[PDB]
Design a protein around this motif. Structure first.
Motif, mmCIF file in Angstrom:
data_model
loop_
_atom_site.group_PDB
_atom_site.id
_atom_site.type_symbol
_atom_site.label_atom_id
_atom_site.label_comp_id
_atom_site.label_asym_id
_atom_site.label_seq_id
_atom_site.Cartn_x
_atom_site.Cartn_y
_atom_site.Cartn_z
ATOM 1 N N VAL A 117 0.894 -1.228 0.210
ATOM 2 C CA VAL A 117 0.015 0.042 -0.120
ATOM 3 C C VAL A 117 0.738 1.295 -0.065
ATOM 4 C CG1 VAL A 117 -1.700 -1.042 1.117
ATOM 5 C CG2 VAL A 117 -0.412 0.341 2.583
ATOM 6 N N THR A 118 0.348 2.137 -0.676
ATOM 7 C CA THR A 118 0.719 3.799 -0.120
ATOM 8 C C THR A 118 -0.263 4.054 0.950
ATOM 9 O OG1 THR A 118 0.869 4.204 -2.554
ATOM 10 C CG2 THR A 118 0.484 6.263 -1.043
ATOM 11 N N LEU A 119 0.576 4.310 1.907
ATOM 12 C CA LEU A 119 0.061 4.503 3.304
ATOM 13 C C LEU A 119 -0.252 6.040 3.349
ATOM 14 C CD1 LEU A 119 -0.880 4.148 6.189
ATOM 15 C CD2 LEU A 119 1.530 4.597 6.941
ATOM 16 N N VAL A 120 -1.473 6.668 3.414
ATOM 17 C CA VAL A 120 -1.848 7.902 3.484
ATOM 18 C C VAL A 120 -2.192 7.930 5.007
ATOM 19 C CG1 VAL A 120 -3.110 9.925 2.728
ATOM 20 C CG2 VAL A 120 -2.579 7.787 1.078
ATOM 21 N N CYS A 121 -1.620 8.919 5.860
ATOM 22 C CA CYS A 121 -2.142 8.794 7.094
ATOM 23 C C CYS A 121 -1.814 10.273 7.850
ATOM 24 C CB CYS A 121 -1.121 7.880 8.080
ATOM 25 S SG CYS A 121 0.630 8.194 7.828
ATOM 26 N N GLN A 122 -2.617 10.533 8.982
ATOM 27 C CA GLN A 122 -2.843 11.843 9.616
ATOM 28 C C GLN A 122 -3.231 11.629 11.111
ATOM 29 O OE1 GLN A 122 -6.230 13.013 10.373
ATOM 30 N NE2 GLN A 122 -5.451 14.981 11.226
ATOM 31 N N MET A 146 0.847 13.177 6.794
ATOM 32 C CA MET A 146 0.268 14.618 7.103
ATOM 33 C C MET A 146 0.217 14.389 8.823
ATOM 34 S SD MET A 146 -2.691 14.594 4.171
ATOM 35 C CE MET A 146 -3.086 12.836 4.261
ATOM 36 N N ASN A 147 -0.154 15.928 9.290
ATOM 37 C CA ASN A 147 -0.185 16.164 10.507
ATOM 38 C C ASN A 147 -0.102 14.918 11.597
ATOM 39 O OD1 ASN A 147 -1.022 18.374 9.005
ATOM 40 N ND2 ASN A 147 -1.046 19.614 10.930
ATOM 41 N N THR A 148 0.626 14.502 12.136
ATOM 42 C CA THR A 148 0.440 13.358 12.726
ATOM 43 C C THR A 148 1.974 13.201 13.593
ATOM 44 O OG1 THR A 148 0.363 10.710 12.706
ATOM 45 C CG2 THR A 148 2.162 11.904 11.265
ATOM 46 N N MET A 243 5.357 14.297 2.246
ATOM 47 C CA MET A 243 4.816 15.005 3.539
ATOM 48 C C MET A 243 4.223 16.309 3.293
ATOM 49 S SD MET A 243 6.457 16.375 6.990
ATOM 50 C CE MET A 243 6.961 14.634 7.721
ATOM 51 N N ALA A 244 2.993 16.455 3.817
ATOM 52 C CA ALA A 244 2.113 17.880 3.933
ATOM 53 C C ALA A 244 1.752 18.098 5.243
ATOM 54 C CB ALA A 244 0.834 17.745 2.859
ATOM 55 N N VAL A 245 1.934 19.463 5.518
ATOM 56 C CA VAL A 245 1.458 19.901 6.736
ATOM 57 C C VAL A 245 0.356 21.048 6.892
ATOM 58 C CG1 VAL A 245 2.343 20.695 8.942
ATOM 59 C CG2 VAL A 245 3.866 19.558 7.490
ATOM 60 N N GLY A 246 -0.681 20.871 7.623
ATOM 61 C CA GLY A 246 -1.624 21.957 7.677
ATOM 62 C C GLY A 246 -1.071 22.919 8.805
ATOM 63 N N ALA A 247 -0.789 24.052 8.137
ATOM 64 C CA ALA A 247 0.027 25.035 8.943
ATOM 65 C C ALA A 247 -0.890 25.584 10.140
ATOM 66 C CB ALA A 247 0.399 26.289 7.971
ATOM 67 N N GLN A 248 -2.263 25.431 10.184
ATOM 68 C CA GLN A 248 -2.815 26.152 11.202
ATOM 69 C C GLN A 248 -3.128 25.184 12.566
ATOM 70 O OE1 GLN A 248 -6.168 28.381 9.786
ATOM 71 N NE2 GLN A 248 -5.333 27.960 7.571
ATOM 72 N N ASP A 249 -2.332 24.337 12.492
ATOM 73 C CA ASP A 249 -2.618 23.152 13.674
ATOM 74 C C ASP A 249 -1.502 23.387 14.483
ATOM 75 O OD1 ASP A 249 -2.539 20.842 15.123
ATOM 76 O OD2 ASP A 249 -1.700 19.392 13.440
ATOM 77 N N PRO A 250 -2.188 23.787 15.965
ATOM 78 C CA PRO A 250 -1.632 24.291 17.231
ATOM 79 C C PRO A 250 -1.231 22.910 18.253
ATOM 80 C CG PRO A 250 -4.069 24.162 17.470
ATOM 81 C CD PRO A 250 -3.767 23.803 16.100
ATOM 82 N N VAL A 251 -1.081 21.681 17.407
ATOM 83 C CA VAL A 251 -0.650 20.594 18.286
ATOM 84 C C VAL A 251 0.474 19.845 17.409
ATOM 85 C CG1 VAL A 251 -1.246 18.406 19.491
ATOM 86 C CG2 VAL A 251 -2.863 20.298 19.415
ATOM 87 N N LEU A 252 -0.178 19.154 16.214
ATOM 88 C CA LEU A 252 0.723 18.515 15.327
ATOM 89 C C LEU A 252 1.111 18.925 14.126
ATOM 90 C CD1 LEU A 252 -0.846 14.712 15.941
ATOM 91 C CD2 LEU A 252 0.674 15.814 17.448
ATOM 92 N N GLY A 253 1.321 20.309 14.276
ATOM 93 C CA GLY A 253 1.761 21.299 13.076
ATOM 94 C C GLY A 253 3.165 21.489 12.492
ATOM 95 N N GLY A 277 -5.826 22.967 8.428
ATOM 96 C CA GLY A 277 -5.315 22.893 10.044
ATOM 97 C C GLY A 277 -4.802 21.463 10.310
ATOM 98 N N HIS A 278 -5.115 21.357 11.585
ATOM 99 C CA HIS A 278 -4.693 19.757 11.899
ATOM 100 C C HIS A 278 -5.253 18.654 10.887
ATOM 101 C CE1 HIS A 278 -4.156 16.322 14.373
ATOM 102 N NE2 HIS A 278 -5.266 16.047 14.517
ATOM 103 N N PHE A 279 -6.558 18.914 10.685
ATOM 104 C CA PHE A 279 -7.329 17.907 9.697
ATOM 105 C C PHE A 279 -7.104 18.222 8.375
ATOM 106 C CE2 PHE A 279 -9.949 17.989 13.671
ATOM 107 C CZ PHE A 279 -9.626 16.760 14.027
ATOM 108 N N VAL A 280 -5.868 18.266 7.800
ATOM 109 C CA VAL A 280 -5.458 19.132 6.687
ATOM 110 C C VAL A 280 -5.978 18.306 5.251
ATOM 111 C CG1 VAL A 280 -3.202 17.685 6.299
ATOM 112 C CG2 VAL A 280 -3.550 20.153 5.513
#
Length: 297
Positions: A117-122, A146-148, A243-253, A277-280
């Motif tokens: 698999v291509t693992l897609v995760c957050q 992603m954000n994890t 890797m992609a990161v939702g910038a507005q996450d104030p925990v796992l950002g 955000g977190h749920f990018v």
């Protein structure tokens, strides 16, 4: 094991989520329980994208990324963890452990005979999914992360601890209100889709327990598995990585993710999704397109 099942009429109205439900029963070690998953695309696809959700979301969260994956000829498989989405939901909070969720994921893969698999995760999809290679070293051939975090027995942050305490202080956590705070632009109809699994507090045992079981001191359950997983990604992994990161996450950002980037062998610089955000995955259509272009697809 006591459990409740969400009525099907809760899942009628859903925006951009027409996908037929698929279910598994009789999973070894979860006899009694039914697991829901999205399964789209040809079942002999060259690439199967295994999309793992976290806290307190479900496969609904992958609905903007999924059509980009299928557009590219992919199969998309997105399970709802027990306690979430259209899966059955144990009522006793004490049943939800790191091992309970990890084993479900392994039972789930074995049942579909998914071996590559291509693992897609957050979020928890990555806390769990990133540890799958510890048991199944050839399972992941590419990663979209992603954000994890890889939970190794440290806190992800001051933001994490506040969040955890807040969930502990919320016996009937309003999931739709939380998503409204957390996801820029979320419509009312999308909020109701995140409320949909949870008609009442007896449905939220897994929602309540999740933050409390992130292994943030060295000897909590799952921490050592986390350390083993970090070893794999830092020293054995050589697959394509995005890797992609939702910038507005104030925990796992951005913070936590830059460190993870460096710990994943070959991970290039992250795509920063300032809209997200977190749920990018809510701003994830461009993430899926950019992953694919990076992977030479």
């Amino acid at each position: 094991m006591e459990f409740v099942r969400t009525p099907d009429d809760r899942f009628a109205d859903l925006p951009d989520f027409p996908y037929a439900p698929h279910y598994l029963e009789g999973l070894p070690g979860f006899e009694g329980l039914r697991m829901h998953y999205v399964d789209e695309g040809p079942r002999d696809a060259e690439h199967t994208f295994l999309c793992l959700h976290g806290e307190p979301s479900w496969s609904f969260l992958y609905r903007k990324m999924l059509p980009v994956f299928t557009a590219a000829g992919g199969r998309v498989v997105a399970p709802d963890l027990f306690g979430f989405g259209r899966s059955d939901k144990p009522t006793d909070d004490a049943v939800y452990t790191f091992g309970f969720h990890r084993r479900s994921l392994l039972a789930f893969l074995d049942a579909l005979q998914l071996e590559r698999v291509t693992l897609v995760c957050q979020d928890w999809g990555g806390i769990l999914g990133l540890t799958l290679p510890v048991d199944r070293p050839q399972l992941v051939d590419r990663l979209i992360v992603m954000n994890t975090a890889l939970a190794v027995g440290l806190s992800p942050g001051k933001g994490f601890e506040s969040w955890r305490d807040f969930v502990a202080n919320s016996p009937d956590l309003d999931v739709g209100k939380l998503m409204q705070r957390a996801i820029p632009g979320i419509t009312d109809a999308e909020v109701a889709a995140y409320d949909a699994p949870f008609p009442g507090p007896e449905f939220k045992a897994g929602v309540r327990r999740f933050p409390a079981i992130v292994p943030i001191t060295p000897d909590m359950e799952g921490a050592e598995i986390g350390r083993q997983a970090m070893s794999f990604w830092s020293t054995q992994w050589s697959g394509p990585t995005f890797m992609a990161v939702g910038a507005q996450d104030p925990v796992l950002g951005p913070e936590v993710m830059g460190m993870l980037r460096q710990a994943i062998r070959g991970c290039p610089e992250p795509m920063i999704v300032e809209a997200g955000g977190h749920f990018v995955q809510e701003h994830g259509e461009p993430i899926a397109r950019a992953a694919l272009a990076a992977f030479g697809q």
